[PDB]
JSON list of C-alpha atoms in Angstrom, two decimals:
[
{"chain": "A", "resi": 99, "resn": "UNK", "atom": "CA", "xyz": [98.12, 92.87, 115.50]},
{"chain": "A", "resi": 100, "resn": "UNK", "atom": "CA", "xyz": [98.41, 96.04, 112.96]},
{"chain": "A", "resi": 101, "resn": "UNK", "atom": "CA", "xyz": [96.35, 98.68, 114.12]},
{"chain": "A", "resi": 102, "resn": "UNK", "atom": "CA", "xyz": [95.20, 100.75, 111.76]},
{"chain": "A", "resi": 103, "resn": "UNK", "atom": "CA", "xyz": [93.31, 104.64, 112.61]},
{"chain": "A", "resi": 104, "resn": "UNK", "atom": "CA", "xyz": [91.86, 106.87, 109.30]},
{"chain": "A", "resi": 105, "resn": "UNK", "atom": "CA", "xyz": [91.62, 110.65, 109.84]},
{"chain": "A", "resi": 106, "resn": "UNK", "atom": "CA", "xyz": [87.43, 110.33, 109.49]},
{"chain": "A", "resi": 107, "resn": "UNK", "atom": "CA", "xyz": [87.83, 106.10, 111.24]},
{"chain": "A", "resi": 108, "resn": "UNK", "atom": "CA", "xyz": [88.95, 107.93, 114.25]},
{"chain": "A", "resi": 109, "resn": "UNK", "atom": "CA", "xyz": [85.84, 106.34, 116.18]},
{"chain": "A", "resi": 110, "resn": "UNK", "atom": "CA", "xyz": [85.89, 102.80, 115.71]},
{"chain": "A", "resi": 111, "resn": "UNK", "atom": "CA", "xyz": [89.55, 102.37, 114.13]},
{"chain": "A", "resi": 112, "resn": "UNK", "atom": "CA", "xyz": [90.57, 98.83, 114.34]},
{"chain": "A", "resi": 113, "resn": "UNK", "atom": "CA", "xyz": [93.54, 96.21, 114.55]},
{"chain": "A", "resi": 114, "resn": "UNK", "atom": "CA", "xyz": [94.07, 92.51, 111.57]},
{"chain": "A", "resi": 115, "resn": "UNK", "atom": "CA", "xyz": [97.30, 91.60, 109.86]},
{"chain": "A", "resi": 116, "resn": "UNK", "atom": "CA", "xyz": [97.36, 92.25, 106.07]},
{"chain": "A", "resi": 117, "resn": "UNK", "atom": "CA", "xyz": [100.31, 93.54, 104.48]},
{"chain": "A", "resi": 118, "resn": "UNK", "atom": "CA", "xyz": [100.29, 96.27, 101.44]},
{"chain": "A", "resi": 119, "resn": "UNK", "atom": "CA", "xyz": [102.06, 98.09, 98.83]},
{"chain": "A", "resi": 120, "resn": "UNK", "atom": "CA", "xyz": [102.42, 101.74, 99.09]},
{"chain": "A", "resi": 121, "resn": "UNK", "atom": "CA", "xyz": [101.73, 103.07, 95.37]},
{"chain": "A", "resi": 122, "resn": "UNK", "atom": "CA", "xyz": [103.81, 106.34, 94.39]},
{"chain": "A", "resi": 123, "resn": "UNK", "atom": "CA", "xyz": [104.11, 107.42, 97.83]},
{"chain": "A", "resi": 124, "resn": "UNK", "atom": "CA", "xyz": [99.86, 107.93, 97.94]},
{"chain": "A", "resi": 125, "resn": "UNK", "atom": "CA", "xyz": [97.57, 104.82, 98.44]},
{"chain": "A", "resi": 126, "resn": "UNK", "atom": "CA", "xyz": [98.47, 101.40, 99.71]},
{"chain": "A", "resi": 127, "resn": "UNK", "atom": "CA", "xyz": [97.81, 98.70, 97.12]},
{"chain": "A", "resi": 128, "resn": "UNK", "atom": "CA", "xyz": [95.96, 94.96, 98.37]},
{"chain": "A", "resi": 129, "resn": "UNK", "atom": "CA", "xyz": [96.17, 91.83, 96.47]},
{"chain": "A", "resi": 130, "resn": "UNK", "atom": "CA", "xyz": [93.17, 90.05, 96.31]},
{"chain": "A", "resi": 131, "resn": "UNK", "atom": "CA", "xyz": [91.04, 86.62, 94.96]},
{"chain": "A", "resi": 132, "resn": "UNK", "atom": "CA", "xyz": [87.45, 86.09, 93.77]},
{"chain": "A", "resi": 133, "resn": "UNK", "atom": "CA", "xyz": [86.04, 83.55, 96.58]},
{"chain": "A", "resi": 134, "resn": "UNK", "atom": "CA", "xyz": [82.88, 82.26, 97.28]},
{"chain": "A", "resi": 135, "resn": "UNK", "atom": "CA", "xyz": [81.13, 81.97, 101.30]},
{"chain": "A", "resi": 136, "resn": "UNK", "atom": "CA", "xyz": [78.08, 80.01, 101.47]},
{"chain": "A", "resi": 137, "resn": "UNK", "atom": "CA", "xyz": [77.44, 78.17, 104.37]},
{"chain": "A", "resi": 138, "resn": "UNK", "atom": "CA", "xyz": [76.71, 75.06, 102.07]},
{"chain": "A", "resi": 139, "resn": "UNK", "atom": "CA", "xyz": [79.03, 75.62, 99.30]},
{"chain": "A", "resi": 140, "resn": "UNK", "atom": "CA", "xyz": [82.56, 76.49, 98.75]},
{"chain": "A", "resi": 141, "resn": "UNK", "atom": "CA", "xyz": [83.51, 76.79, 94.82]},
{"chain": "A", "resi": 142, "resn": "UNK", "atom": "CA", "xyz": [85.92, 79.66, 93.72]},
{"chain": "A", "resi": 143, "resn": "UNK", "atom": "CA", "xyz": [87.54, 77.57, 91.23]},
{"chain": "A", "resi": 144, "resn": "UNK", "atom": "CA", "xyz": [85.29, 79.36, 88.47]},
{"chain": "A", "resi": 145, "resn": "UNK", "atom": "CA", "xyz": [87.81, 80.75, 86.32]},
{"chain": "A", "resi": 146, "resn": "UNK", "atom": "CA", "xyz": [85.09, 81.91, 83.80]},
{"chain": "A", "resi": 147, "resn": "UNK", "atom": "CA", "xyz": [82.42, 83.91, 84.75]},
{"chain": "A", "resi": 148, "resn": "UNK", "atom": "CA", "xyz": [83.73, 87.62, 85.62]},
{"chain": "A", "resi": 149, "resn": "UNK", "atom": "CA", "xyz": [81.85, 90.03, 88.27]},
{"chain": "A", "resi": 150, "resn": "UNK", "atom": "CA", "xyz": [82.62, 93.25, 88.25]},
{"chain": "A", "resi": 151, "resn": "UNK", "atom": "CA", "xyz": [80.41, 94.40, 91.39]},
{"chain": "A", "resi": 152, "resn": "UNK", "atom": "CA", "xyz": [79.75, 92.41, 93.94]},
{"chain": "A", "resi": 153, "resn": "UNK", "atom": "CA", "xyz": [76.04, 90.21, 94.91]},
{"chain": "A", "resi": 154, "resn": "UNK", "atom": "CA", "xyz": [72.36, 91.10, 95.59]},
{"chain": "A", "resi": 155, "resn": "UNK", "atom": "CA", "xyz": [71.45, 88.72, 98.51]},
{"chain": "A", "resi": 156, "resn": "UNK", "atom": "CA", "xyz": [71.64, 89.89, 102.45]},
{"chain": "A", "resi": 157, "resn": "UNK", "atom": "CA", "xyz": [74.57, 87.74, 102.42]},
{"chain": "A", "resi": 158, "resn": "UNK", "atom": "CA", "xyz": [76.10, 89.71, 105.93]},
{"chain": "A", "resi": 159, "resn": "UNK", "atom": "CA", "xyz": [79.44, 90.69, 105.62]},
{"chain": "A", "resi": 160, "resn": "UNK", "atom": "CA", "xyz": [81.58, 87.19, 106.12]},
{"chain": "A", "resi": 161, "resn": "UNK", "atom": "CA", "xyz": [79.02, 85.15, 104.55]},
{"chain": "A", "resi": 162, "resn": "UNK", "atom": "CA", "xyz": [78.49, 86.95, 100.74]},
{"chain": "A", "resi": 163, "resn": "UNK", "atom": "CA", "xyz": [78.36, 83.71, 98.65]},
{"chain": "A", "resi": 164, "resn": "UNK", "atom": "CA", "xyz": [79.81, 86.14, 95.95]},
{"chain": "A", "resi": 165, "resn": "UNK", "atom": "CA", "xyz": [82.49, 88.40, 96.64]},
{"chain": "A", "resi": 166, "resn": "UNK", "atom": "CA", "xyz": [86.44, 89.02, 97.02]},
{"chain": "A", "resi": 167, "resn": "UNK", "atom": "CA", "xyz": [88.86, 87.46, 99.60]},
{"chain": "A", "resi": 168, "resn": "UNK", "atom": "CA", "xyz": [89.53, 91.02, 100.62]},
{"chain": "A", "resi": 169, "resn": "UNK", "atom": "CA", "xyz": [86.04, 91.56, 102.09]},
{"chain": "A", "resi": 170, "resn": "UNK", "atom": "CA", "xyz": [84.83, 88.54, 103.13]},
{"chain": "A", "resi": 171, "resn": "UNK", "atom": "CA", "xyz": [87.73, 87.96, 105.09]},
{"chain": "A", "resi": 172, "resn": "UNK", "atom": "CA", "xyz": [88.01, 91.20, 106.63]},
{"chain": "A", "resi": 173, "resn": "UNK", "atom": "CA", "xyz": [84.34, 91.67, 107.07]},
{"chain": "A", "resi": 174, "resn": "UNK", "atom": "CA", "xyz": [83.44, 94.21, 104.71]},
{"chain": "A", "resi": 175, "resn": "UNK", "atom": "CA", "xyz": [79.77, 94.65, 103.51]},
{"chain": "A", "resi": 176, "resn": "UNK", "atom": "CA", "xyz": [79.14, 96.13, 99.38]},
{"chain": "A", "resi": 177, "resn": "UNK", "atom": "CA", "xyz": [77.88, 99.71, 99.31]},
{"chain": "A", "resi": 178, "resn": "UNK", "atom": "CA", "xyz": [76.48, 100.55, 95.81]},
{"chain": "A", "resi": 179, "resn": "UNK", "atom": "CA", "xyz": [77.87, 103.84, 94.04]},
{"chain": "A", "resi": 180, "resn": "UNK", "atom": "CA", "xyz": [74.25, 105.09, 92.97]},
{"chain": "A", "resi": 181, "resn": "UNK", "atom": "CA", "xyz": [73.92, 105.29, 96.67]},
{"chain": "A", "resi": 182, "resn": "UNK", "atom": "CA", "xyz": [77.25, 105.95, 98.14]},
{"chain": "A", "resi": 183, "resn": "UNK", "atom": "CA", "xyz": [77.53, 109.36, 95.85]},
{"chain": "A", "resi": 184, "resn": "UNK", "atom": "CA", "xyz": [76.55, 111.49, 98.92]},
{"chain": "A", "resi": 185, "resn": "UNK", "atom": "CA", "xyz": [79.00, 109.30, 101.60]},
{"chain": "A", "resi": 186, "resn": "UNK", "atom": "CA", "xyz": [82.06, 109.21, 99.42]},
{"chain": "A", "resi": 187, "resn": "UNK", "atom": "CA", "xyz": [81.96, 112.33, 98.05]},
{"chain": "A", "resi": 188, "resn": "UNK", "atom": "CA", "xyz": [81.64, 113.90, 101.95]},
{"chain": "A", "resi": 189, "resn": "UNK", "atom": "CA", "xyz": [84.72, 111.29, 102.91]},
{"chain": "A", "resi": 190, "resn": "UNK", "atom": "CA", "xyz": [86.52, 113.34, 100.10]},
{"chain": "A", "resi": 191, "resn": "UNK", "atom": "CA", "xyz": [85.44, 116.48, 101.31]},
{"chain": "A", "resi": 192, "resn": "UNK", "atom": "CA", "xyz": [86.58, 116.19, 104.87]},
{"chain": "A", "resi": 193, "resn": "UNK", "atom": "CA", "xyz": [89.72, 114.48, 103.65]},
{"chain": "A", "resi": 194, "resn": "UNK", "atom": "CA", "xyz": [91.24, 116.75, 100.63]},
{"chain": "A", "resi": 195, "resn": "UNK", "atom": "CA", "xyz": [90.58, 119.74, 103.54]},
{"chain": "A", "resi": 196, "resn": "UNK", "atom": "CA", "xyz": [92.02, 117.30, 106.37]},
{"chain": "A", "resi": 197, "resn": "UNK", "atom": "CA", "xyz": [95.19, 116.08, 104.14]},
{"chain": "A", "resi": 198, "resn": "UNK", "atom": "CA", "xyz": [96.22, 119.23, 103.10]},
{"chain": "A", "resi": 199, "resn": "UNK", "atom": "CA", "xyz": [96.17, 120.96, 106.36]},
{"chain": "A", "resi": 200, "resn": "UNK", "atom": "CA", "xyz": [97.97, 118.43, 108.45]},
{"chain": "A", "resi": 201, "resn": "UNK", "atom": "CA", "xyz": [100.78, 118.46, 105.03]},
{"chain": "A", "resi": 202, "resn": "UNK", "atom": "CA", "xyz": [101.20, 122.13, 105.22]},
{"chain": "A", "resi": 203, "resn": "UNK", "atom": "CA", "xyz": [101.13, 122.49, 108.65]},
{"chain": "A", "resi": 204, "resn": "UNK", "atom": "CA", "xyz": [104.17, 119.92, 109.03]},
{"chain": "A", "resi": 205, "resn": "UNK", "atom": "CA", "xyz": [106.45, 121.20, 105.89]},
{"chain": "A", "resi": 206, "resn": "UNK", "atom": "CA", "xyz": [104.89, 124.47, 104.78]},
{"chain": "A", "resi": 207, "resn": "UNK", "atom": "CA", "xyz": [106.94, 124.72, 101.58]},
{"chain": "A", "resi": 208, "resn": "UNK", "atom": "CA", "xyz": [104.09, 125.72, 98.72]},
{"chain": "A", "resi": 209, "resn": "UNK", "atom": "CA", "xyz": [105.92, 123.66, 95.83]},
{"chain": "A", "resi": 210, "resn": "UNK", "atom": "CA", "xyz": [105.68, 120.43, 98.15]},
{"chain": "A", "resi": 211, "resn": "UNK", "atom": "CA", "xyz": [102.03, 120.57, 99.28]},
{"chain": "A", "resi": 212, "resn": "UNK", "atom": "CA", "xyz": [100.94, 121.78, 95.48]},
{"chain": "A", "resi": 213, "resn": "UNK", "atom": "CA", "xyz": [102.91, 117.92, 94.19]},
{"chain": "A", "resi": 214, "resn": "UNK", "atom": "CA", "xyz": [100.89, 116.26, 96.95]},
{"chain": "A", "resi": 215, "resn": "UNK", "atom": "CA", "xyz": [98.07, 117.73, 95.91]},
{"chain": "A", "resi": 216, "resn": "UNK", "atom": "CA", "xyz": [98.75, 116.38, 92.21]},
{"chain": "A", "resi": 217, "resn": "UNK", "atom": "CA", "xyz": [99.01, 113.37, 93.62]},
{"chain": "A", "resi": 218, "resn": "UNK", "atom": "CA", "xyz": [95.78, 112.79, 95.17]},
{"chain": "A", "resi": 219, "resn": "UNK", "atom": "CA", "xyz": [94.01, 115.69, 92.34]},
{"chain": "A", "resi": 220, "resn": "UNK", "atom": "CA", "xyz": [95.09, 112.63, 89.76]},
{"chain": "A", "resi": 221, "resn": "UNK", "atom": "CA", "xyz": [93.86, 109.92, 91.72]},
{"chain": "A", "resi": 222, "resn": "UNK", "atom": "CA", "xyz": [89.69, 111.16, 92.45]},
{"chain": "A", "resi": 223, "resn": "UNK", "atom": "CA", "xyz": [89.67, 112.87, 88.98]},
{"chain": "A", "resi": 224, "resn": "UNK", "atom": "CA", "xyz": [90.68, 109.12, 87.47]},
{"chain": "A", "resi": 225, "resn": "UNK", "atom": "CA", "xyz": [88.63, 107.80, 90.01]},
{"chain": "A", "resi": 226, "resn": "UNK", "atom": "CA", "xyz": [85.67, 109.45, 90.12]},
{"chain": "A", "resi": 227, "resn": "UNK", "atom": "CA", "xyz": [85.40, 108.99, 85.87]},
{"chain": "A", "resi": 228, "resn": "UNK", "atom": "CA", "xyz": [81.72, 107.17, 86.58]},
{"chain": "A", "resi": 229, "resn": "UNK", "atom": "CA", "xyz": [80.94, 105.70, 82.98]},
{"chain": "A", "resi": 230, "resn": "UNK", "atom": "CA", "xyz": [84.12, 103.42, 82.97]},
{"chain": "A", "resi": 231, "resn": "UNK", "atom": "CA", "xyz": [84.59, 103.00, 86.89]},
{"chain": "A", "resi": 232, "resn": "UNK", "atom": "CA", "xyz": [81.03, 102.70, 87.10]},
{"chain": "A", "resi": 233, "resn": "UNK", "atom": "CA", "xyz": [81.61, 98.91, 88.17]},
{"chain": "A", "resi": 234, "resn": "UNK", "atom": "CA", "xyz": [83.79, 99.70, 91.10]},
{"chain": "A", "resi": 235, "resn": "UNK", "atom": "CA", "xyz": [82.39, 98.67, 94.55]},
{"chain": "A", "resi": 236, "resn": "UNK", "atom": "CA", "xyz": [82.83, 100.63, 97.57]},
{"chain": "A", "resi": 237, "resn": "UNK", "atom": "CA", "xyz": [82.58, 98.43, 100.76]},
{"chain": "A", "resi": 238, "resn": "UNK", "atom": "CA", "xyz": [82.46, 99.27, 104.41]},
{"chain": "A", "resi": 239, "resn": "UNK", "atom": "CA", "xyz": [83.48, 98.01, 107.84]},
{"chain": "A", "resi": 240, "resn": "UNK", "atom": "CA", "xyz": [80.79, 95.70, 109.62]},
{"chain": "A", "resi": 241, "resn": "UNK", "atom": "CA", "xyz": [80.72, 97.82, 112.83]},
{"chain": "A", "resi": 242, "resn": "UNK", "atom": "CA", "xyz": [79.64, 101.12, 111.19]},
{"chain": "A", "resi": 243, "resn": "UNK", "atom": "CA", "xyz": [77.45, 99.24, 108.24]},
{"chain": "A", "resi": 244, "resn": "UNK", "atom": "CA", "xyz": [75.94, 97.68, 111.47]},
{"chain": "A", "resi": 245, "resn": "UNK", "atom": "CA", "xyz": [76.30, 101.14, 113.83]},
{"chain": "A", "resi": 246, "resn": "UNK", "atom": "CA", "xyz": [75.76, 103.40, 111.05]},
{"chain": "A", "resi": 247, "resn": "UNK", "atom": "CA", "xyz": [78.01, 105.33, 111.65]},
{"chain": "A", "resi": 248, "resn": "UNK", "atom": "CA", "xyz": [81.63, 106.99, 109.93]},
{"chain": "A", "resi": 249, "resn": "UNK", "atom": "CA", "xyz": [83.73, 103.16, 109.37]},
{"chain": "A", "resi": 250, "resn": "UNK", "atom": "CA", "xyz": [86.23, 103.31, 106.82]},
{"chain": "A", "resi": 251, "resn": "UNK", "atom": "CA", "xyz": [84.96, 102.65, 102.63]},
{"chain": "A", "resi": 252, "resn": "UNK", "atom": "CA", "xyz": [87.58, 100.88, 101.06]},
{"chain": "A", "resi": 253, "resn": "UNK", "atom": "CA", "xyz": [88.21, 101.15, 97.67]},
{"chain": "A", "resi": 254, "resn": "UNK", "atom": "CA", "xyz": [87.30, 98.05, 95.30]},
{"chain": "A", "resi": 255, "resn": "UNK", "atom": "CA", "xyz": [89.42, 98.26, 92.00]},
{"chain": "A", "resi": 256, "resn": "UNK", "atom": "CA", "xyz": [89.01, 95.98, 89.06]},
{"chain": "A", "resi": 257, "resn": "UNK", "atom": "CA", "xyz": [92.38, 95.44, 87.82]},
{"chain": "A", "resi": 258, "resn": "UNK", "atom": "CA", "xyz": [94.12, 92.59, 85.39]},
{"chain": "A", "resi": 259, "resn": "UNK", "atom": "CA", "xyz": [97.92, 91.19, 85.66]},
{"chain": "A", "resi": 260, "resn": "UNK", "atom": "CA", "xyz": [98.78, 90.35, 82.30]},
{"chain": "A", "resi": 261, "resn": "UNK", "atom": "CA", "xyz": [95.48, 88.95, 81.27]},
{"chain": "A", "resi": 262, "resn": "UNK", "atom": "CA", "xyz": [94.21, 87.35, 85.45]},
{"chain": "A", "resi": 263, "resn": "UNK", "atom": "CA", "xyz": [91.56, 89.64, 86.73]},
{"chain": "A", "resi": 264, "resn": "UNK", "atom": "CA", "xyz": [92.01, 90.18, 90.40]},
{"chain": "A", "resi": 265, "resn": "UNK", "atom": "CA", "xyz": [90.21, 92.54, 93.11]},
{"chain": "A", "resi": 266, "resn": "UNK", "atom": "CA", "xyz": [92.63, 95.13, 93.89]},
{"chain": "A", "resi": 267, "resn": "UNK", "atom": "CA", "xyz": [92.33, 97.43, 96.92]},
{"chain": "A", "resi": 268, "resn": "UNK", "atom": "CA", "xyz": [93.30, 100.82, 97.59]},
{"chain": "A", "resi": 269, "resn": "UNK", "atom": "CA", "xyz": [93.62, 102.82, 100.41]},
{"chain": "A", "resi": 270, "resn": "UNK", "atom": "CA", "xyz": [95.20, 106.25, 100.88]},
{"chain": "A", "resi": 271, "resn": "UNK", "atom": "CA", "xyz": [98.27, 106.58, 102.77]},
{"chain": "A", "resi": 272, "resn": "UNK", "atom": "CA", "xyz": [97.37, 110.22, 104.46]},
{"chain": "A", "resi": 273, "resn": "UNK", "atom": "CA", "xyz": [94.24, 108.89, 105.40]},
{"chain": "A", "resi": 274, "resn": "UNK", "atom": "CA", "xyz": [94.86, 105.23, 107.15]},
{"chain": "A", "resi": 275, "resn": "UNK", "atom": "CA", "xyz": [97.51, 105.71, 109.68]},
{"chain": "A", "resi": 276, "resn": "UNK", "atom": "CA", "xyz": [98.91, 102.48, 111.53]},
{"chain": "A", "resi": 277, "resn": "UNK", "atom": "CA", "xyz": [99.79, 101.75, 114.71]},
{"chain": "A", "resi": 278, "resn": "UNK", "atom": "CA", "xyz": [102.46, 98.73, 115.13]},
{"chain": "A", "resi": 279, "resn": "UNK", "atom": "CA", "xyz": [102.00, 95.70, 117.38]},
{"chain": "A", "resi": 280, "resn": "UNK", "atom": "CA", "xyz": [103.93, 92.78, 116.61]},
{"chain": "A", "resi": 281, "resn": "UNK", "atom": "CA", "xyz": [107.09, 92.41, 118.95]}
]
């Protein structure tokens, strides 16, 4: 059981088992699969009709009809952009100021902290371009969607391998912090 804390998840921070690929040192990279959960009707074969954001019905969290293997099995409810504009852009706020201090208080050295700071100053700026990310999807843990309180967003990419689109999630690294359980 991975337990995994973010720097603004410190409340309800919580344990699965998913592994992940840490992406130029910043933001851990999840493979995922377009999947349907309907309690009468399981058909994901559908290799046809693309989606780009996620459904529209009150689906609850596990049981979205139309969504990714990423959320559905994790538990992760869709937050629209239009809305989330205030809540992601406040995550960013506390984080940049969060990340930054906890760097520079650690190694100090001005040329390090300023490369991090590329790092993660190319990653929002790409991000955050709305027209053509406009159809990313930010989705949240079930206890705060439920609680309403600070649960982690994760960060729904649409990305392609060769040609096969597949959900890709992000997460970044000096943000989600893990706590190991296995042995």
């Amino acid at each position: 059981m991975l337990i995994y804390k973010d720097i603004f998840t410190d409340d309800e921070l919580s344990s699965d088992s998913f592994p992940m690929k840490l992406v130029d040192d910043l933001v851990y990279e999840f493979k995922g699969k377009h999947v349907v959960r309907k309690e009468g009707e399981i058909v994901l074969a559908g290799s046809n009709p693309s989606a780009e954001e996620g459904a529209e019905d009150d689906g609850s969290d596990e049981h979205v009809e139309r969504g990714i293997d990423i959320v559905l099995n994790h538990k992760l409810v869709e937050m629209n952009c239009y809305e989330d504009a205030s809540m992601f852009k406040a995550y960013i706020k506390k984080f940049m100021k969060n990340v930054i201090d906890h760097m520079e208080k650690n190694n100090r050295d001005k040329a390090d902290v300023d490369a991090f700071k590329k790092k993660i100053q190319g990653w929002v700026v790409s991000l955050l371009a709305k027209d053509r990310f406009k159809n990313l999807a930010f989705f949240i843990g079930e206890r705060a969607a439920e609680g309403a309180e600070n649960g982690q967003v994760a960060i729904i990419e649409y990305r392609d391998v060769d040609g096969t689109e597949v959900p890709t999630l992000m997460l970044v690294k000096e943000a989600i912090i893990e706590e190991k359980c296995l042995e």
